[PDB]
Symmetry: D3
Subunit: 120 residues, 6 copies
């Protein structure tokens, strides 16, 4: 069951930061995109989602203070063998056909927290 | 796709959009009426995003009367009076992307019955 | 007694679905009215309120995008002897007098939660 | 949006937000003589639907709990909110323990300073 | 520093911490009672962060009864059962750091009081 | 000036990403620290605060799943002449003296949001 203060990096080096998970299962966090061929790289995008045991969904709105890519991604997946294995779907604002929804597979590995006693 | 809208799919399942925030954040609930899926006829919570005509929304299949140990995410777009969606359903305890169920839902808007009193 | 993911059905067949109770006591859930003659039947309405031990309040906005009945109900009650005993107050939009506010008593009995291992079955 | 409502006792309802769903959020200061939980802030939730309103206060905060909850039901009419309220105590056994009455709330005009000084 | 903890400073002002999330997110209210200040004896909203003994919280001096057109931010720490803080107060329309007001507040905890009834 | 979806970068290359400002003035966003000689660099941290015309406070909790620096910063400042001018205070968990609270001045300048039509 994926927990609050967790971070998950995919094969493209994109990271999901889970900042909270309610007892209700409601997930909150942010996402840095580092995938080649995708705009909206390097800056934080908001995340909402659900956790139910090892099942997870999470979706990112591709709009923030620095860059907007006029789109939304939803990942559906499961926690298994220390990684989140997901199928994702990307929809573009102004789409008119299902063929324009891009599909793919992301697998996320957990990062371990580097702890400093001070900002320095 | 604004606050206080409802959308019914080819199976007669309804998404109730309670609010859409300025930030795009979606809040609401969902009634499944699709044959061959459990968790029918009672409301499940929805979160998601709206960005113009693009929408994602996802349902946690646990409520006060029935839990089905799963989550559905819908990805799609509003166009020509309908939300065209692709959905993925994941079961708690899954070990393979082959256990994730996929389909397409077409959501048509409900027209409101307005009464002056309860 | 009153907790997250408990369902409560009154003498008329209406159901409060308590989804969540925060550590703060904040209640979120859903209401389906099934009360004979009343409008806005068999369609879910949002709920907010408070739980404090056996004390509960919860209020339903009778507006969703399918059916709207131009009103708000507030229930005030307590859990005791395996039931929630409530007094409710229903206000209609456009009211001009306290005399137009409708009141009654709802007794809510618990329903147990059904567990399935999948949505497929 | 941001608004303040004061009743016959000088109890003040502070509405901090109203969603487009009509969901109400804010806080409340009780000044009613005889109740405890006076003159400190308590959390508020409710609904607004046209001229109809409900709002309810949990009587627990960092300094004082009174082990109870109040729910107000009413309507906007001639620049005021006319309400019926019901108050339930935790541990109650009977509807006879549910205290009910009426409150009228007038809008509080916002006193603008340009400094905390 | 926890949910439903009350803190009163040398000037009689109280911090009412309503909630602290597992994340460290702080919500609550503030009543100012300090001589020489506007916006006294009505509740203002508080946000901030707790991280072990480290705390920040900040008050917008606007509610629908009295606004003072300013914001305070406290930075401090829980030490020997008290919170020691340095505060900065900024007024709307400021053009110099010299117009920001600074001081020190030491906040003492008050045990939460329990009445049987209301 | 200070609004939903405005980004603000200080003299050290640290960016405040304001995601939303409610009607009430409640600020929600993200921060990426890029300042030479600090921990918790190049990873986003959560922001809460208040906006009241040109007055702003915001505070960053130096904890995420990749890196924690056991501390919190609060910025107090005002938008003026295209810039947010701020004084900041940095408190480390387990401090025992106000002497241990570090301070400085940050000047944040805004970027124009870029619109890419495709991701």
């Amino acid at each position: 069951g994926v927990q609050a203060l967790s971070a998950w990096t995919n094969q493209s080096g994109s990271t999901l930061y889970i900042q909270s998970v309610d007892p209700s299962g409601s997930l909150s966090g942010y996402y840095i995109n580092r995938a080649a061929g995708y705009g909206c790289q390097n800056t934080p995008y908001p995340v909402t989602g659900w956790v139910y045991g090892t099942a997870i969904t999470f979706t990112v709105l591709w709009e923030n203070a620095t860059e907007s890519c006029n789109s939304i991604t939803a990942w559906t997946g499961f926690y298994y063998q220390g990684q989140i294995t997901t199928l994702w779907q990307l929809v573009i604002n102004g789409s008119t056909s299902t063929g324009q929804i891009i599909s793919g597979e992301d697998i996320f590995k957990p990062s371990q927290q580097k702890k400093s006693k001070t900002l320095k």
